[PDB]
Structures are given as structure tokens and as C-alpha cells.
Design a binder for this molecule. Structure first.
Ligand code: HC4
Length: 125
């Protein structure tokens, strides 16, 4: 495993060194999005939670195509505000229920170290 704890204060620094293969060693789901919500990275733990095949969701838009549960002011709304402000660091619980058994998760969204990229971290609660 890669020893990084969910919710760690310097998580963006740690994950900046990881390739897709290293991301797959995290104890929690991790998705990297561009400013438009397009999926840049999607790790194995997330695929384990949602059932989606990581290779197949990369390049798709998270909010429009992949995870319409999140297209709401409570999730998407927060993301868009963060993108516009250039700053984002928020944690909340949510339920994923599209084409799957309803699953309650903890979500942490944080801006990445790189300019126009954003992390969504996910773990079961
Ligand atoms: C609602 O959010 C439904 C599905 C979904 C699929 C993949 C990921 O990663 C999150 C959510």
C-alpha cells in the first residue's frame, strides 16, 4: 500500500509524486478532475466502491456522464465555486445511487498542487 491517510493536511503534496499505478495503492478512492470536471485519473479503490472500470471512465465528464448523482448544488455546485475561486477544500458525506446499490460515502475535494486540477477523495462510512 501507499501510506497516506484520508483527510491528511498535505495530501496534495504527497499525491503529486504518484503515477496511476501508485494511486491504485491508496486505501481510499481518488479521482483527479480538470476544471471542466473531466476525469484525468481514477483509482482502483474508487472502482471498488462504484463498480466503474477506471480505464473506461477516464476522459469522460464526471458530472454529466459518469456520476449524475453529483450534479447538484451540494456537490457540483461546490466544485464549480472552487474552480472559479482557485481554492477548494471541503469534506462532506454523500450517497452514490446511479446504476448501483445506494452507497454512503465521505467525500473530500481539494485543489491539486498543479494549476487546473482537482482531487475528489472517497471512502466508505
Ligand atoms: C452517482 O454519483 C453515481 C455514480 C458514480 C460513479 C462513479 C463514481 O466514481 C462516483 C459516482
Amino acid at each position: 500500500m501507499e501510506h497516506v491517510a484520508f483527510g491528511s493536511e498535505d495530501i496534495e503534496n504527497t499525491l503529486a509524486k504518484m503515477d496511476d499505478g501508485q494511486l491504485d495503492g491508496l486505501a481510499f478512492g481518488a479521482i483527479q478532475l480538470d476544471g471542466d470536471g473531466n476525469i484525468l485519473q481514477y483509482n482502483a479503490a474508487e472502482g471498488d466502491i462504484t463498480g466503474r472500470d477506471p480505464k473506461q471512465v477516464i476522459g469522460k465528464n464526471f458530472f454529466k456522464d459518469v456520476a449524475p448523482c453529483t450534479d447538484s448544488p451540494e456537490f457540483y455546485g461546490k466544485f464549480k465555486e472552487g474552480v472559479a475561486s482557485g481554492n477548494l477544500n471541503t469534506m462532506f458525506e454523500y450517497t452514490f445511487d446511479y446504476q448501483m446499490t445506494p452507497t454512503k460515502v465521505k467525500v473530500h475535494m481539494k485543489k491539486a498542487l498543479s494549476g487546473d486540477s482537482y482531487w475528489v477523495f472517497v471512502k466508505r462510512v
